[PDB]
Amino acid sequence: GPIPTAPRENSLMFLSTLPDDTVPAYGNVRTPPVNYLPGEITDLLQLARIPTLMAFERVPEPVPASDTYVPYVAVPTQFDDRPLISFPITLSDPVYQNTLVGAISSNFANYRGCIQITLTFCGPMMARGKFLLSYSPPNGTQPQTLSEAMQCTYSIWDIGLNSSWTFVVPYISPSDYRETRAITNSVYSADGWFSLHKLTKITLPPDCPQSPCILFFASAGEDYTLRLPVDCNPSYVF
Amino acid sequence: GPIPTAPRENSLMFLSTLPDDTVPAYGNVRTPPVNYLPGEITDLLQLARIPTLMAFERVPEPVPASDTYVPYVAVPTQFDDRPLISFPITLSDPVYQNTLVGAISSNFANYRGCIQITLTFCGPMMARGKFLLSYSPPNGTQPQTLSEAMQCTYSIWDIGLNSSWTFVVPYISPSDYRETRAITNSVYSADGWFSLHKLTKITLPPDCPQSPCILFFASAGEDYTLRLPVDCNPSYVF
Amino acid sequence: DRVTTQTAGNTAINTQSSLGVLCAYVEDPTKSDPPSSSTDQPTTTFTAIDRWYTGRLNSWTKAVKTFSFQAVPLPGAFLSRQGGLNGGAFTATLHRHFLMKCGWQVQVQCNLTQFHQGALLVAMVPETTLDVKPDGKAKSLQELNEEQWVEMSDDYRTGKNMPFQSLGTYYRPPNWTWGPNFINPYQVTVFPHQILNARTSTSVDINVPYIGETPTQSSETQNSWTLLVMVLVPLDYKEGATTDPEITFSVRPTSPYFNGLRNRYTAG
Amino acid sequence: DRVTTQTAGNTAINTQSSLGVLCAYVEDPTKSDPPSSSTDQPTTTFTAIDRWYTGRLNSWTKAVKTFSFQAVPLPGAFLSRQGGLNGGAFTATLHRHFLMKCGWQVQVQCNLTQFHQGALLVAMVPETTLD
Amino acid sequence: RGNNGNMTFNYYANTYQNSVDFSTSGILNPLGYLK
Amino acid sequence: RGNNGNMTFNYYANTYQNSVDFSTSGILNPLGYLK
Amino acid sequence: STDNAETGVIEAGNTDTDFSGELAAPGSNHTNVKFLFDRSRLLNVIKVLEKDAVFPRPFPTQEGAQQDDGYFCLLTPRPTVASRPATRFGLYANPSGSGVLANTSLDFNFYSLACFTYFRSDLEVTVVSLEPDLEFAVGWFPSGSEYQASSFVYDQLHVPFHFTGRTPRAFASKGGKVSFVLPWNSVSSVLPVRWGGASKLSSATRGLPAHADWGTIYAFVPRPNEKKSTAVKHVAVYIRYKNARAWCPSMLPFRSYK
Amino acid sequence: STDNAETGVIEAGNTDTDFSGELAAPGSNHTNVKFLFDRSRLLNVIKVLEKDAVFPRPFPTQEGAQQDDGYFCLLTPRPTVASRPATRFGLYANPSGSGVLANTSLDFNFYSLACFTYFRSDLEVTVVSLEPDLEFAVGWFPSGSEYQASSFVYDQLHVPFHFTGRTPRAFASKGGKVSFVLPWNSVSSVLPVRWGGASKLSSATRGLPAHADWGTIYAFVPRPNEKKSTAVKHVAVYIRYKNARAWCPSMLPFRSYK
Ligand SMILES: [Ca+2]
């Protein structure tokens, strides 16, 4: 006979994220095989690990072409005891906006793990020089001086045969996960700053272009993870 | 095919205390581990067993500071054949209001087991004296005399090297459980009185402060149990 | 027995009336692991910071009322040098790290006499804002000296006066009636504590492990533990007896882990 | 080979033209024991001071004559912050101890070009008052 | 357990019905010890 | 799996609940190889 | 550490590579493709048919044409215009003027994370009423198929042929919803998120796929033509990707700095 | 019996310790933490959105601001004010005057028994209509996330983006209810019942936690903006703690003797 049941208060509810299936309406359909297709992606982290270019406003001297954002930093010849460039370790910051790590990460609420900054020297091969890359966890005031940067996490990069240098921003946080978007500024959504200082000015022989450029890439480190899918920002269509 | 069912009369009902789960809407979430955190509490009885201070209206002679309630009783020098202090064994009585036992117990309908009163002498070490603590189950009239108290459950406490004395109020009831709140006065919600008599007046040497104080604590005995969660009294916010 | 001497580094504190050390939550609050929330090798205990630091609190007088108190934020007191609590290398290291995790061993000293009477409740209280004024600012050394002891009041019993964000002119200012950081004076014995009763001892010891809403915390802002000294029974004595007995305390950070080394902290 | 990266704490210094590390007197100048002249338990290395500190020296010009020099006292330079050499926790610890024993690993950086000429002698000199 | 009387069946997997900590790889005890 | 917490039962057969290719008869790999 | 990005391959490092530390344990697998796209999102809002319709004609459509617009919903995350496949996505900043305002759709969420070239999955469809106490039905025809127009007369009442057929028709209860899953049914093996080909050898639009969809759905009232109303009713169409798979890494939409 | 409370440890005795008797057998385990908090209680009453909203701005908010108040519900037993975390709990004894009356909430029951410092559990949410025959939907975004504003136009109708997304959206039947459980999702390990820290290094409010919550919920009508009404609708939000755990003994609110 009939099985007695007691439907719950949420009967007939439509839950967009319900972890279950619904009834098939047109089954017994066989599809063309996809074994011939290479390049299958299993997890978006596979793409977040691919380094992509960052973006910086071209030093107050833009090109007649509107929206003058560049993927590199030109190394000025004049000495100055402050960073050549610096940006916060806040994933929602515009410098990461168009990198895959940043774009993908903006679609989740949290991240855990290391971010990786990769630099590629694009000046002439005859050039020589050294740079000091540093990462400073939050402080009341952002460090500017070489003396200050040198007291944080840093590495000195030497220009030579090999063109690039990878710099892993350690995951130093009070919480096991951090906010992907700095809706409100806090120690959970803003984790300090990365900065690049020229250690010893670039040296060039005669008849060599000046101001060599350094390309910047960002990507997820090997232990980088994203959690909690969130609603997307549809503005890219406006 | 379809399974025949017979939904019951209470279908679609929302029961706030239903002993069952509901559907998950955002699963597969891993959380930061909490192994690093010490002090986990499994049962609120663990807290009810921690003795906390009781409160008495300071003998008709308050301090210029409003709401003059004190956690102790000063021992007067003048002889008087009546209790120094006494209170009912009714958990809703104001003397237990701010003790953890009382506060926690007020959130359940019943209790079973012993209540424990702990006294700590805070006079000078040169002081000597004896007290008679007694518990009287219900009677038509509350006992006042030393001769009456002495016929109930009692213990004589001697002041000396050790500063405190614990007194367990036996659980003497007609019913296996008792009411936590004396909404209506009855043998099930009011179980008599606890009283403190000075047996032999306190003796002090010259140049010693007078009126030593006795701190009062209340807590759940080892066999104390609470039953039936009830609605809270939200007035603490008004 | 009652006579003990606790050593740590080039430090040793003695007492001849010990009541034993009250250990909170676990038998050895000293056992602790590195924070799982930081991938950088932490700086751990070294001999220059494995020791007792000693400071002062305001004296106890006959005038201090029941439930009046004094609070010592940890590690806050090290940062502001409350009571002359200079943390030597500990503070220097604290100022140079974003994160810090540690436990504490504390002893409060206050000798009376066999002719004095009164009792102080000494507790280690988790997550309080007792060191802050209702306007949100931390009490300065001068303000602590002017008040001496904070009187228990409806505001404190209610949490009505804890720090808060003003809403702005857009909103009707509401009637603040309660706060989660309230203090129910009668239940302060729920915390790890000992009572310094004039008649039984001249000191108390408490040993607590690290606690927090996260595996580790911001050096500059955390206040998971607060040393609380509160009057339970007013001080009293006859003319001729020593007046205004002093109160001091010793604090030892245990199993510290520092993460996120950087240049010295500079207020923004 | 010529490309090396030396790590220490939250620090790493790279060079693509290394000549190798010149170790003085012993194969591992790092091996060392506590001083026999102090009976108190010493404070030894902790991660916040096991790292490289970097500073500046005055620039090299065509006008500098043969045998002209610059000197960096150790640990003196940490104490005076010569060249912006702030020793973080190292200096803080140094200032709080009567005695200190230690060795040093140093790297001097100065890039030129395949079109420049000149040579600098870089040495670690014992017991001088050149500062 | 909690306030749950369902002994029988669990339709949704444990990791969906509940959250679980990720790995980093009767008898009521006292909350204080005197040593 | 996907966003599915149903460990228990599958009322409809696999070939009806899903489509399957007809026959012609953790560890994340790289999408690029340098050779 | 030392590297050469020109190579086209850069290894992902960790704190201990150049500094001192360890790896952070994995916190989740939410970036998993199958798990990520397995959730419902709004695809389009369509009008409810109250009589047999005349499917929108192919482009370019000239003024004077008689057809029903805004009724058919092409099941695809790709841009659509007037129930047909599209390349450019458009909207109307100035809804003022002359001419029919073409319905357009786009799975905004899908493209914000579609960093790949090809995609495939089954599709769970849910239709929700945007009208109070509405009794409606849903119709659907496969990719490569078409809407069966006209009607037949029963007791002098005109009943659209869309009431019958061999494809799914779901009649919801009054005030109820409709839900079911459809299999990948296009003749193509996978769906091109972006495409560079052409479906015809002559006068073709480069980049416009011919069958990158799971078919077309429409909604109608279970009433004969005669009992027609005047107030247009709307219904919302939700889709969910089941057993999603993706191939060939690609870009995510450009985010303006302005 | 003889003791010394100064020690900080007092053993729980029984009738036979100093007198003559026995132990009373255990009557229940209702003080068990997991069992005790595993029941639904009212958290807040919110208004139902009938168009895309403008989330309340951060404090201090100045007069003249354009925003929707009383719509968003922060899921927390902690005090809240205008959909945001709070420290002090307030109400309006004099509802007469000028200025918006901020919505405030507090799990009264939770705090009456929250004699501990930290807490953690999953959260079962139930939304009940306080209006007759109401058809509504519920939206929710995780702790640390935010409401997606604005809308898109379909058939000249404005449909808020809160109709779509990747987070839970629950459409109830007409006159029905909504219910589901959420996992602990804050980046913090546990929820601080009372807190003594600060979430920022500058101009921070001591004691105000940044993410002590299970996210935020709101309710809306499954209708386009145009079909908006004038009568404000209300919905009640209930919460239940699943698999609750608590740490570090603490105090219960002070009970006045007046
Ligand atoms: Ca049924």
Swiss-Prot record, chain D:
Compartment list: Virion; Host cytoplasm
Domain of life: Viruses
Role of this protein: Forms an icosahedral capsid of pseudo T=3 symmetry with capsid proteins VP2 and VP3. Together they form an icosahedral capsid composed of 60 copies of each VP1, VP2, and VP3, with a diameter of approximately 270 Angstroms. VP4 lies on the inner surface of the protein shell formed by VP1, VP2 and VP3. All the three latter proteins contain a beta-sheet structure called beta-barrel jelly roll. VP1 is situated at the 12 fivefold axes, whereas VP2 and VP3 are located at the quasi-sixfold axes. Binds the host receptor ANTXR1 for attachment and uncoating (entry).
Subunit and interaction comment: Interacts with host entry receptor ANTRX1.
Protein name as catalogued: Capsid protein VP2
Covered residues, full protein: 162 to 292 of 2181
